[PDB]
């Protein structure tokens, strides 16, 4: 389901792990520095994400954390279908870029990451009244409720 | 702005702090166990929240964490207006605790149970049939406000 498909992947900065989720159909993202690239941390991130948006399918790579039994259980509980097997790469790249631009503006990396996410989701680039990723996701989900 | 107003407050369970945010106009909530009831943890939660939804005004009580300079800076950066000072946030904490109680056994840790509870609350429909869920009301409210 186009409105319920997300892609997850981990990227790294300053020796830290950043878990990233992208709503494919809109470009909206959610990211967060996790203490360790474990299935436990990944499962925790997934539950929060699923309680927020209609997460039906998550696409990830071969990563141990994503293939873990704990993430599997989280997905079954949340009714999320998994697929291990474009977009997420671009996001990690651009997220790192924005993080770079605002890095000085905050003490810890985790804060910079959230500033970057905010900037990315609020960012526009269409006409004088196009749409931001944040606006596209709610529009997509709203129109799908009817 | 009705669509941009949120209320935040902390509640407690098992000796832990649970930070809770409620989108007043829809009943949609976001909660999370934080290591400590500090301005730092509160500011972190607020940034995440603001990058997700159109947070324009946050209403909280007199709490040190909410009045802290670090939260103040977060709000200025995020362009969020603060107000210090109803029944809504109280009801949510109460019901969240209720749902947490119902699913407490399905999770290894409280923090997980909290997220299960949030998921259940936001997905819940009155009477379990038709109608709108809090999750659907918030996106509808925000969507109709974009036009
Ligand atoms: Mg990977
Ligand atoms: Mg309190």
User: Which one of the ligands is nearest to B63 CA?
Assistant: 2
CATH topology of domain A1-146: Nucleotidyltransferase; domain 5 (3.30.420)
* DSSP bridge partners of B19: B10, B32
What does the alpha-carbon distance between residue A63 and residue A60 come to, in Å, rounded to a whole number?
8
Q: DSSP secondary structure string, A16-58?
A: EEEEEEEETTTTEEEEEEESS--HHHHHHHHHHHHHHS---EE
What does the alpha-carbon distance between residue A131 and residue B2 come to, in Å, rounded to a whole number?
21
How buried is residue B87: exposed, middle or buried, by Cβ count under 10 Å (0-12/13-18/19+)? exposed
The reply to whether residue A145 touches residue B140, judged by beta carbons under 8 angstroms, is yes
**CA B108 to the chain's CA centroid:** 22
Residue B106 CA to ligand 2 center (angstroms) comes to 26
Q: How many residues does chain B have?
A: 147
The approach used to solve this structure was X-ray
Nearby residues of B21 by Cβ (< 8 Å), 6 or more positions away: B6, B7, B8, B29, B30, B31, B45, B49, B58
- What's the Cα-to-Cα distance from B29 to each of A75, A112, A127, A131, B59, rounded to whole Å? 21, 24, 33, 25, 14
What does the alpha-carbon distance between residue B93 and residue A40 come to, in Å, rounded to a whole number?
26
Report the Cα–Cα distance between both ends of chain A, in Å, rounded. 15
What does the alpha-carbon distance between residue A70 and residue B104 come to, in Å, rounded to a whole number?
17
B5 with B57: CB under 8 angstroms?
Answer: yes
CA nearest neighbour of A73 among A47, A53, A49, A98: A47
Residue A99 CA to ligand 1 center (angstroms) comes to 19
Q: How many CB atoms lie within 10 A of CB B102?
A: 13
The reply to whether residue B139 touches residue A142, judged by beta carbons under 8 angstroms, is yes
Ranges of each domain in chain B: 1-147
Nearby residues of A29 by Cβ (< 8 Å), 6 or more positions away: A20, A21, A22, A23, A91, A95, A117, A120, A121, A133
Which residues of A define the annotated binding site for Mg(2+)?
Answer: 9, 61, 89
Tokens of A68: 């873990």
Query: Which residue in the block uniquely carries the two structure tokens 């009301």?
Result: B137
Which residues of B define the annotated binding site?
Answer: 9, 61, 90
Residue in A with minimal Cα distance to B47: A114
Helices B39-52 and B69-78, packing angle to 10 deg = 10
What does the alpha-carbon distance between residue A55 and residue A40 come to, in Å, rounded to a whole number?
18
CATH number for the segment(s) B1-147:
3.30.420.10
Documented resolution in Å: 2.5
Phi, psi of A31 (to 5 degrees): -145, 155
Interruptions in chain B after residues (C–N over 2.5 Å): 85
Nearby residues of A59 by Cβ (< 8 Å), 6 or more positions away: A5, A6, A7, A8, A24, A83, A84, A85, A88
Helices B110-123 and B87-103, packing angle to 10 deg = 120
Q: Of B44, B122, B146, which is closest to A51 when you measure between CB atoms?
A: B122
Element (DSSP H or E) covering residue B43: helix B39-52
Strands A81-84 and A57-60, sheet pairing = parallel
* DSSP bridge partners of A28: A23
Substitution target in A3, A118, A129 with the highest count of B β-carbons within 10 Å is A118
Is any Cβ of chain B less than 8 angstroms from the Cβ of A145?
yes
Tokens of B21: 């945010």
Residue A78 CA to ligand 1 center (angstroms) comes to 22
Q: Count contacts between A and B (CB, < 8 Å).
A: 69
User: Which one of the ligands is nearest to A18 CA?
Assistant: 1
What does the alpha-carbon distance between residue A79 and residue A50 come to, in Å, rounded to a whole number?
9
């Amino acid at each position: 389901c186009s409105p319920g498909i997300w892609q997850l992947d981990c990227t790294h900065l300053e020796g830290k792990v950043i878990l990233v989720a992208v709503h494919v159909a809109s470009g909206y993202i959610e990211a967060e520095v996790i203490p360790a690239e474990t299935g436990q941390e990944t499962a925790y991130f997934l539950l929060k994400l699923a309680g927020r948006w209609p997460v039906k399918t998550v696409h990830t790579d071969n990563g141990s954390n994503f293939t873990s039994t704990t993430v599997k259980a989280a997905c079954e509980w949340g009714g999320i279908k998994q697929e291990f097997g474009g977009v997420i790469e671009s996001m990690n790249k651009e997220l790192k870029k924005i993080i770079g631009q605002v890095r000085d503006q905050a003490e810890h990396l985790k804060t910079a990451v959230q500033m970057a996410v905010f900037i990315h989701n609020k960012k526009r680039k269409g006409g004088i009244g196009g749409y931001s990723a944040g606006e596209r996701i709610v529009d997509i989900i709203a129109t799908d409720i009817q």
